[PDB]
């Protein structure tokens, strides 16, 4: 979710913005090979 | 299943919500390249 | 993000250019196995 | 970048050719475990 | 080919059978990051 | 092209046969994460 | 466009031919998970 | 195979269970950089 | 296994925690070049 | 763990900082050939 | 380059054959920890 | 080559067989720190 | 071989056990600077 | 740390420069078999 | 064996402790230039 | 042990200090050609 | 540094050349058991 | 240099051949405990 | 050379055979403190 | 040879046993200053 | 200690200087066959 | 058992699969004149 | 008996299980051409 | 008789029990292809 | 298997054809006394 | 035919008598494992 | 088929007659243990 | 004939007795692989 | 006879026991390729 | 194949005739102990 | 052929008689280790 | 006996184990061309 | 044993491996005319 | 012939008796390596 | 091995070809009386 | 005869004993290259 | 090779003819005691 | 006798040991060209 | 050839007669130690 | 013994080693015309 | 000829008797080193 | 040795070449009557 959809991912930075919106994280990326929004 | 349908999937969080509803899982994502709801 | 999408990355130097645009970095690469634009 | 994409890297010699195009370098290789084109 | 399709691969043994059809090989796996049937 | 269509790819050997039809190549596979027929 | 329509894409080589018709490109493929004709 | 699929590998212990099912092996791991289930 | 997946491994301490859960081991690490959870 | 991941290790000094945070140690390094954070 | 790709290296003798093709060298190997074809 | 791949090596006897295929040698090992098949 | 892999060698007594399996030897150690299982 | 990563060390004199930057030392080297920056 | 691994050996006293555990020996050390645990 | 590791010995005087810490000895040195801490 | 990296050291004569470049020295070698370029 | 690398030295006669190539010397050996090619 | 490598020597008879290949000598030993094959 | 290796010689009676195995000799000792097994 | 390390001693007069620094001695040498700094 | 039934046997691979489920065997055949699955 | 009924035999392992239930036998098979359960 | 009725034979052990009831026989089986109780 | 069934084997060349279908083999025969199809 | 029916063959000597009734043969037997009356 | 029905087959010569009716065959018999009419 | 029926032979010495009953022979056995009573 | 039945022979030692029961013989074996009990 | 079936082979000259039918061969025989038709 | 069938050869002197029946030969024997009737 | 059955022999070590069980014999083998267990 | 079975032997290396499992032997062959594994 | 069958010869003196029965000869032996009765 | 099987050896040049495949040998022959492939 | 059978000869001393049983002879041996018992 | 097979060699002149076919040789004979075709 | 069997002789020291067992002889050898154990 | 076969030579005077049949020679003998018919 | 076997001898150095195992001898040769190991 | 066969000569005085049977000679001996009956 | 085998010696210059390989010798010949390679 959050825009992590492998080759069909849209460039909206949705995962990054969603992870930033949570306190304690500075960003996010599509883990599980591009299909799981994970916050780092 | 649970909205994991590759490019036709909707950002409904249906997989995520369904996986959260089961005790012991923090969430879910669309494994098998976007076609299988899997709980993590 | 920034074009780091594993096997589906489009060879556009998007991560590298994005990292250069930030002062203090001379480039970037796709860390986390190709899925996280990281500036070095 | 420059074709350094871990397991999905192609054998195009793109990193090597790019590094040769810069004066003072004999070639290049994919450092950071195959994900960062580095000139030597 | 032979069922090596990255995240969309199935445990269909097509690569294994194809490799067994050649003298000297005991199996196959999906090289090139999951997209090329390779005999070992 | 040549049947490289990601999850909707049919194991038709079209990429493989097309690449073998060019002298100097042993075969082909679906690079770019399953969407580009590439000869090796 | 140019025949890049995901699962409903035909094998007409339309994207490849269109990309060849532009000087400076060797061919094309359906990026964005099979829905955007992109020249390389 | 057997759940060894690089970044798209799941944490299902599928390779480990498959290798334990062969009497005499302790377990298995994903060799060849995460793409070949190998028993030990 | 247990999160040991080379470059795609997550800093989940999953191997370490799993190895601690077995009596007699202080921890674990990803041997075989990052792909085999081994308890020490 | 703690950033000790062989060639894919990130330069965040995570192992060193983690070992310093434990009373009795002045630092740490990646033993086992770069894959086990060990405090000295 | 030339098939030196760490854990994802294929035993294709590409580095060896390439190095033998240059007069004065008996062969080659993957230096830099498996990521740089070097002739000896 | 011949299965000498540092931490990612497997006990596949490729180096041993390659060395046995030459008169006078009784085996082989991975020299250059585990990256070069050397006959002894 | 047989677990003699320099810094990446595990403490599994693999070389020792292999050498003891050859009737008449007391044990083995990693000669050639840790890279050759040698029986004594 | 500080660029001491065994075979994957990037030839940047990072350990040496880091050790020189500390008063009382004239250099440094990768001890512990190449994995620990140590100042002398 | 028993932690005798040349430059990569850890000050674990593993050889010493193992040799003490056998009746008649006061301790052990890494003979063969640091690669063979020998009890004295 | 105790820092007696031939050419890889560190200059920490570990053997000397260890031997001094035992009642009845005034020092120690690396006997057995630099590989056995012996108290005198 | 200067190519002194134990078993992974290349035969580039880098330490020797570097030591010659300093007035008053005839050459250099890898002291500290192969890990410290030292001029003589 | 010239193959004098302590325990990781290969019996390649490189030191010997190099020293014989200089007029006035019968051969060479690895002095400094195996780490410096010296002509005699 | 010829297997004379100080503490890392093996009873490989290389020095003995090399010396037997010269008229008048009945064997060889490792002179220069174990680092030079010398015929007697 | 035969355990005559100067300071690195072990107390294993290897030279003595080797010399006794030659029918007619009483024993052996390490001549040439500890580096040549000589029977008497 | 103090630079008495047999064949691996670095020609630094370290033992001699250390012994001179103690009142009542005019120098020192490496006794015990080169492995014990002894003041005379 | 396992499909070994003399003249009434079928090429059902039951014996082969049963034998493959045991470490070390590469197949099976119907011994005892076609009535006993035997692993080879 | 025990399911040994020639062509009408069912692969029920009844003969095998019955024979294993008797101490001293590894298994059983249908002797007499498929009509007599015999323990081996 | 005695339950030997080919495919319609029941698993009543009737033939075996009947044959045991006669002194001098260890058991019985359905000979004549499953239709004649015969004592052995 | 593959038509190797002792006296009940048919003259259908089934083993031979099966072995020829494996590219690189000339044919096959019924080893193990007529009960194991073996390729040559 | 002619009474050659494997385990269901009746003892009427039908094959033998039939073969004797043909001029040039002295008898017959059930070849093909008991299913083909063949005259000898 | 053609009267090959195991124990229920009738001595009708139906398989034999049918096989004779096809040019090139001398006769037929009930292979597969009496259940398949096969022409020879 | 005479009880020579391969695996379905009933252990009745029928062939042997039949052959003894003919003058000039001392016994018989099942030749042709168990399917032809032959007198010797 | 006496259990000599080629591949269908059981391990009952029947031929050996029968041959021992005749005075003047030490045992027996299945001659004629496994089909004739012969005393020696 | 071609009637070579060990003890169950028929004197059909099938191997001999088949081998004669191929130009350059005088005949054939049953090699591999009677189980492989080989042309000479 | 002609009765030359290794251990299953019948004593009918078939090879000898067959060879005598050909003009120019006085007999025959089973060459190729008992499997080829050869006329002398 | 003891598993010596020519081509139908199973590598069960039965002859070897039986012969070792008799004092004075190192082992056994299948003499008489594979049909008689003989102790040596 | 160990695959030494006269004319029915296969090049299975069982004798070779068995002999290699004993100190001092470099191989094995089938002595006693092809029926006894003998180490040399 | 006459009992000369290599390893399968039955110790019956058949060749010797046959040769004695011919006037002018005092015996016979199995020439041609055990496969041809020859009178001397 | 390698086609050296005494009288059952075939004229296939298998030993010769095997020995030539080992670079440096001219050919091979069947030593040990025809049962051991030996290279020269 | 008398146990003289070339490579298949047993060590029964049969030829020697037979030759001793004739007055005037001290023993016997297998002449004609191991195939003819001859008294001396 | 070429018919040189000791006692089992046939007077086929195969070695002689083969040696004549090579320019410069008058003929050949079976050296190595009858087992190696050698051209003179 | 005593292992003297020409080319098929096994280096079992049987002749030597047998001759030493007789008082007055130092040993034995295979006279008569390798076929008669003779004491010297 | 021509009956010159060392210890297996037959007394047929074949070499002598063959050499006499050639004009210019009065006889022949087995040179090369009994293995080459040579005319004198 | 010790490899002295006339024309069937191999250059195996068994005689040489046996003679070297006795004080005072420098080698051995095959006396008695090639059949007795003799030390010189 | 005439019993002159080097080490394999049978002590029959055959050469001597043959030479005496020719008028003008009083005996014969095995010239050419034991391989040619020559009359004197 | 080295091709000195009396009458069975070949003209291969093996003794001569072996003696020339020992630096300082001109050649060799077969002393001891043709059975000992002696260098001069």
Author numbering:
A (entry chain 5), B (entry chain 7), C (entry chain 4), D (entry chain S), E (entry chain 3), F (entry chain 6), ...: 1 to 40
Provide passages from the article that reported this PDB entry.
Plectasin consists of 40 amino acids and shows well-defined secondary structural elements in form of an α-helix (M13-S21) and an antiparallel β-sheet (G28-A31; V36-C39). The structure of plectasin is stabilized by three disulfide bridges (C4-C30; C15-C37; C19-C39), which is typical for this type of defensins and leads to high conformational stability. Plectasin contains a cysteine-stabilised α-helix-β-sheet structure, which remains intact upon fibril formation. We have determined the structure, kinetics, and functionality associated with the pH-responsive self-assembly of the enhanced plectasin variant PPI42 into helical protein fibrils.
We were able to determine the structure of the plectasin fibril at an overall resolution of 1.97 Å (local resolution varies between 1.9 and 3.0 Å) using cryo-EM, which is one of the highest resolutions hitherto achieved for a protein fibril in cryo-EM and allowed an unambiguous structure determination. The structure consists of two coiling protofilaments, which form a right-handed superstructure (mature fibril). Each protofilament has an axial (C2) and a helical symmetry (axial rise z = 25.20 Å and a helical twist phi = 15.75°). The repeating or asymmetric unit (au) for each protofilament is composed of seven monomers. They are arranged in a near-helical way by forming a pseudo-right-handed helix with an average axial rise of 3.75 ± 0.15 Å and an average twist of 156.48 ± 2.25° between two consecutive monomers. The PPI42 protofilament is stabilized by a hydrophobic core in the centre (red spheres) and hydrophobic interfaces between the monomers (black spheres). Even though the local resolution is lower in that region (~2.5 Å), we could conclude that the negatively charged sidechains of (E10) and (D11) appear to play an essential role in the arrangement of PPI42 in the protofilament by forming a network of salt bridges to different lysines. The assembly of the two protofilaments into the superstructure is favoured by the interaction of the loop between α-helix and β-sheet of monomer 1 and 3 in each asymmetric unit with the two symmetric monomers in the other protofilament. The (G24)1 and (K23)1 backbone form three hydrogen bonds with the (K23)3 sidechain and backbone and (S21)3 backbone which stabilize the mature fibril. The interface between the two protofilaments was calculated to be 722 Å2 per asymmetric unit, which corresponds to a small interface area for protein complexes.
